């Protein structure tokens, strides 16, 4: 709808074409549970192919759909803690405000954070303040809208240094099928994305990136085809001679299997090529 997206979600569609369906060198195992009322949990467990390390994760999330409340815990592997309370669409439509905290009983480190955001027609703001140790920081954002045309700007002020350390501006055109997005970071890194919803079964994305004022540039192209209403195929290739492939297959209503393989030119096949096995298991 005419509400402009969050600045952190600009180009989100073209980003996932280069992201979802892949997972090299990391055997990821998850387990999701669906329930709009009550709560939902999801566990995770990624085993590293290289460093044979194991990393688990938990995430319980209660939801009060009658008041917008949404609690959350995590308790990561390396003794990392964290809670989160969310309230939205209560004072007005649509204001969102959350709370956050963290812990680390490894050596005694804490961290707090607050988020904020307001969205309407053609207007979408969002501020974030984190009360981290030795660095309170403010992070605001702004996105406007005008007949598909849509511009944005993000700020990141830091208080211990009393200076702004990051300023990003973005302009783009986004309709229901065609989507363009360009980005600039500190007047140095320049972005670029094009999303093409060709047919009912084909998606196409291209990205661009370069550093100023350098001569070299980095680019890549990706696609996702929906073979079967259960399976799909993903393929991406860039300028560094890397050709990553993916394949998602639904073995059972609620169980999907993802297998991926990263190839490195010009050694196909010769040297070390990273692979992975992602197995979804939603309940």
Structure, described:
This protein has 283 residues and is an all-beta fold. It has one domain. Helix content is 2%, strand content 59%. It is built from one helix and 21 strands. It has one helix at residues 12-17, and strands at residues 26-32, 38-48, 54-57, 60-64, 69-73, 83-88, 95-102, 111-120, 123-132, 135-144, 149-158, 163-174, 178-185, 189-190, 193-196, 202-211, 217-225, 232-238, 242-252, 255-264, 275-281. It has a 21-stranded antiparallel sheet that branches. A hairpin with a 4-residue loop joins strand 10 and strand 11 (149-158). It starts with 11 loop residues before the first helix and ends with a strand. There is a cross-link at residues 12, 20, 53, 109-110, 161, 266, 274 (Glycyl lysine isopeptide (Lys-Gly) (interchain with G-Cter in ubiquitin)). GO terms for molecular function: ATP binding; ceramide binding; cholesterol binding; identical protein binding; oxysterol binding; phosphatidylcholine binding; porin activity; protein kinase binding. ATP binds at residues 12, 20.
């Amino acid at each position: 709808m005419a509400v402009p997206p969050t600045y952190a979600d600009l180009g989100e569609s073209a980003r996932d074409v280069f992201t979802k369906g892949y997972g090299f060198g990391l055997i990821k195992l998850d387990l999701k549970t669906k329930s709009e009322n009550g709560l939902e949990f999801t566990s995770s467990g990624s085993a590293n192919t290289e460093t044979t390390k194991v990393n688990g994760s938990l995430e319980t999330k209660y939801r009060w759909t009658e008041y917008g409340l949404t609690f959350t815990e995590k308790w990561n592997t390396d003794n990392t803690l964290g809670t989160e309370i969310t309230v939205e669409d209560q004072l007005a439509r649509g204001l969102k405000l959350t709370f956050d905290s963290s812990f680390s009983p490894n050596t005694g480190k804490k961290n707090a954070k607050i988020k904020t955001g307001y969205k309407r027609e053609h207007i979408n703001l969002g501020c974030d303040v984190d009360f981290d140790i030795a660095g309170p920081s403010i992070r605001g954002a702004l996105v406007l809208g005008y007949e598909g045309w849509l511009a944005g700007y993000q700020m990141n002020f830091e208080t211990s240094k009393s200076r702004v350390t990051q300023s990003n501006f973005a302009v783009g055109y986004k309709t229901d099928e065609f989507q363009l997005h360009t980005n600039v970071n500190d007047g140095t890194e320049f972005g670029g994305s094009i999303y093409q919803k060709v047919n009912k079964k084909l998606e196409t994305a291209v990205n661009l990136a370069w550093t100023a004022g350098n001569s070299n540039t980095r680019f890549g192209i990706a696609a996702k085809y929906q073979v079967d209403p259960d399976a799909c195929f993903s393929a991406k290739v860039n300028n560094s001679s890397l050709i990553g492939l993916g394949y998602t297959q639904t073995l059972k209503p609620g169980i999907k299997l993802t297998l991926s393989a990263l190839l490195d030119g010009k050694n196909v096949n010769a040297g070390g090529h990273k692979l992975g096995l992602g197995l979804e298991f939603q309940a």
